[PDB]
């Protein structure tokens, strides 16, 4: 268009992009800043970073760029490269990866009254400290702090477009749900510049993790192995394979501990409930193994070198009525030897019986302990309401 060509030539003739668009240097530029979250790209928990795709819409009035539409053939809006006009320098304060400011520099809409409407895209890889206490049933509240860097509040003023960031076109995360989101404006005084307040806007998001993936992939096998640890007591010590089951479950829990450690950050601010549950389960397994070795030793305890004390006989013969289950409530030398053999066999059967009674008691108490422990560990956060 010849009219638009003349208009662009006229506007960008004595225009200096270095200087602020104020008429008098005493005044300030009020930039209306809104952030819209197109997509939550990722939440890296180990590195405590959130990658978000955003559009950083911002509007401000530049007096030097106004014109009369009737002169230039009734043109009321044009589009200009952002490199040709003065741009506010928004910087993401909290930042881990990527640049601090906008780097794409897309074109901007210029209204005939000087109303610039620059909406550039960005990917904010912003640091944000995650609370790993309730894992994986946690909600992460964390923010993006955008502020004008080299200008104080008396020369460049930033103002939020709305109380909340725009999520009209926000893609569903598939891993988090946005419980809440809000932007707040702060006048902060820094040690650099104590006499002038710098303005910033912090947009904070609450993201509640959907735990279905982590539950199925981690928690269910751990519960299964805890149940197997509880079960190991019902196995008869005569068959063997008891230590086999115990050590197999211990190795499985060690592997799952490694897997969980690879997931959560190494911070010590708060111990995760998943970590303390792993520790509880491992202590449970160790106690089961120790008392299992005790039971095995008592079962194979020699009936000759170990005389059965009276107190164990009393306790583990009168305990059975208290428990309601399926348990029971030359010509002469050969005869002498086999009589002694059968007497020793019965004495060993007494030790086998007390070992079986201990096994039943341990089975009951360990099933109860497993159920109570898992309920106490998980129902604290599972009951959100």
């Amino acid at each position: 268009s010849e009219h638009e060509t003349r208009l662009v030539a006229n506007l960008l003739e004595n225009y200096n992009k270095v200087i602020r668009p104020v008429e008098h240097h005493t005044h300030f530029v009020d930039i209306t800043v809104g952030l819209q979250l197109i997509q939550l790209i990722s939440v890296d928990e180990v590195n405590q970073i959130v990658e978000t795709n955003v559009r950083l819409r911002q509007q401000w009035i530049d007096v030097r760029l106004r014109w009369n539409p009737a002169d230039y053939g009734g043109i009321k809006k044009i589009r200009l490269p952002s490199d040709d006009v003065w741009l506010p320098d928004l910087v993401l304060y909290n930042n881990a990866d990527g640049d601090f400011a906008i780097v794409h520099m897309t074109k901007l809409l210029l209204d005939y009254t000087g109303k610039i409407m620059w909406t550039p895209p960005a990917i904010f890889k912003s640091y944000c400290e995650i609370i790993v206490t309730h894992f994986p049933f946690d909600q992460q509240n964390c923010t993006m702090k955008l502020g004008i860097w080299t200008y104080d509040g008396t020369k460049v003023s930033i103002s939020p477009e709305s109380d909340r960031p725009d999520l009209s076109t926000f893609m569903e995360s598939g891993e988090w749900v946005m419980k809440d989101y809000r932007g707040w404006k702060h006048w902060v005084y820094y040690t650099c510049c104590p006499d002038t307040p710098y303005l910033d806007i912090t947009y904070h998001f609450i993201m509640q993790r959907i735990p279905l993936y982590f539950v199925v992939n981690v928690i269910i096998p751990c519960l299964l192995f805890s149940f197997l640890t509880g079960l190991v007591f019902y196995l008869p010590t005569d068959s063997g394979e008891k230590m086999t089951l115990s050590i197999s479950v211990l190795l499985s829990l060690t592997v799952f501990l490694l897997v969980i450690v690879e997931l959560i950050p190494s911070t010590s601010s708060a111990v995760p409930l998943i970590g303390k549950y792993m520790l509880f389960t491992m202590i449970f397994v160790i106690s089961s193994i120790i008392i299992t070795v005790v039971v095995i030793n008592t079962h194979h305890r020699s009936p000759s070198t170990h005389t059965m004390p009276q107190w164990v006989r009393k306790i583990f013969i009168d305990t059975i009525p208290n428990v309601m289950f399926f348990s029971t409530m030359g010509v002469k030398y050969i005869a002498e030897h086999m009589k002694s053999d059968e007497e020793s066999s019965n004495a060993a059967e007494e030790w086998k019986y007390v070992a079986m009674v201990i096994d039943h008691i341990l089975l009951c108490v360990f099933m109860l302990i497993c159920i109570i422990g898992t309920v106490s560990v998980f129902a604290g956060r599972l009951i959100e309401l």
Binding site: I19, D89, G330
Partner: protein
């Protein structure tokens, strides 16, 4: 806007390729001040320290000086750094190729020529990781700033001053500081350093070093690695109470303990650098417990061999029988053929009983030995991990504290 006229007047006869020396032999005083906003991470595998900082470079440029009376009392303007001469202060000890700052913010220039530049930066500095006392270790990292182009005859790197007192620290700002979690900053001194191996015209003669002495908080590691490892390794002494009569599965338990310790060794390797100058304390403990477990596997094999000996294959001499039965435990605490067969089987049974008694005595003695060894090793390792605190002073010989 009078700023337009002022800036077009300043940058008229001005080019950024020339150091603003007043005359010949005039050194530009460039002063630095770091501000640590967030200690982002310390990646051990790459031996890198990633920090978010604001660096304050302050100098004087006589060309950019004006008269406030002629410009409606304007005493401060912002000029893009790309249009001005810069001292080219760079981080020398960077793991990547990023030498200069990330953003290149504007420079505040005053009426007298004072230049104040405060760009932010993400610095991936390099520091060797002293992994001797991991995870109860403290790391002494540093950020070294030099002038990439100018030497000591042209610029003069210095630390910032506030009221005559030079800022000798990193100046954590309360408004915008964030704790790192696992790492806590015990000391943060700053110091100008020289080489004395180069003359003062080599651009590396003068440096400014900001030291971060940080301490790892080991609660996470204690809960997630050390405690499970100690609990699992404590099962290897439990093997001496299992029977040796072709059951109890002593070998399976000991080998499973060894395999679990190997898994923990792999886990440790997945969190420790490959510096290879020293072996980590947790690594030393893992090697010790694996060696103890191997010895206990040997002991289980020997006990199974002794307790399963029969009068056929082995003869129980009285010198060994009496030694292991009467002394150490106190210190430790047609019928003619039928009768002959019964006696000949009873003799073998008695020999087997004596052998299993010898095996049990050996089991008790070796259990006490192994329990004492394991307890002493664990206590020594995790007590020398303790009693290892950050030094009281930042630089050890100096009596200064280097704090605000």
């Amino acid at each position: 806007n009078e700023e337009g006229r002022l800036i077009e007047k300043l940058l008229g006869d001005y080019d950024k390729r020339i150091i603003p020396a007043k005359t010949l032999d005039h050194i530009i005083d460039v002063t630095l001040k770091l501000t640590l906003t967030n200690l982002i991470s310390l990646n051990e595998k790459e031996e890198a320290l990633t920090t978010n900082v604001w660096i304050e470079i302050q100098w004087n440029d006589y060309r950019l000086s004006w008269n406030t009376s002629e410009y409606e009392g304007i005493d401060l303007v912002r000029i893009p750094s790309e249009l001005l001469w810069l001292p080219d202060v760079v981080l020398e000890n960077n793991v990547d190729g990023q030498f200069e700052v990330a953003y290149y913010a504007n420079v505040l220039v005053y009426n007298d020529g004072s230049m104040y530049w405060l760009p932010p930066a993400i610095y991936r500095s390099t520091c060797p990781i002293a992994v001797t006392y991991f995870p109860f270790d403290w790391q002494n990292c540093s950020l070294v700033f030099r002038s990439q182009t100018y030497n000591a005859h042209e610029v003069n790197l210095q630390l910032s001053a506030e009221e005559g007192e030079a800022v000798e620290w990193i100046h954590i700002d309360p408004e915008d500081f964030t704790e790192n979690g696992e790492w806590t900053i015990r000391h943060r001194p700053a110091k100008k350093n020289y080489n004395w191996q180069l003359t003062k015209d080599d651009t590396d003669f003068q440096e400014i070093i900001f030291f971060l002495i940080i301490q790892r908080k080991p609660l996470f590691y204690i809960i997630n690695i050390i405690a499970p490892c100690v609990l699992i390794s404590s099962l290897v002494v439990l093997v001496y109470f299992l029977p040796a009569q072709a059951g109890g599965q002593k070998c399976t338990l000991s080998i499973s303990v060894l395999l679990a310790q190997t898994i923990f060794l792999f886990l440790i390797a997945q969190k420790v650098p490959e510096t290879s100058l020293n072996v980590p304390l947790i690594g030393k403990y893992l090697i010790f417990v694996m060696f103890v477990s191997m010895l206990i596997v040997m002991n289980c094999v020997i006990v199974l061999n002794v307790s399963l000996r029969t009068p056929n294959t082995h003869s129980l001499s009285e010198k060994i029988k009496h030694l292991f039965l009467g002394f150490l435990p106190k210190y430790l605490g047609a019928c003619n053929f039928i009768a002959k067969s019964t006696k000949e089987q009873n003799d073998s049974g008695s020999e087997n009983e004596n052998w299993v008694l010898i095996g049990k005595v050996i089991d008790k003695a070796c259990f006490w030995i192994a329990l004492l060894l394991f307890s002493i090793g664990t206590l020594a390792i995790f007590l020398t991990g303790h009693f290892n605190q950050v030094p009281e002073f930042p630089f050890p010989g100096d009596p200064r504290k280097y704090v605000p």
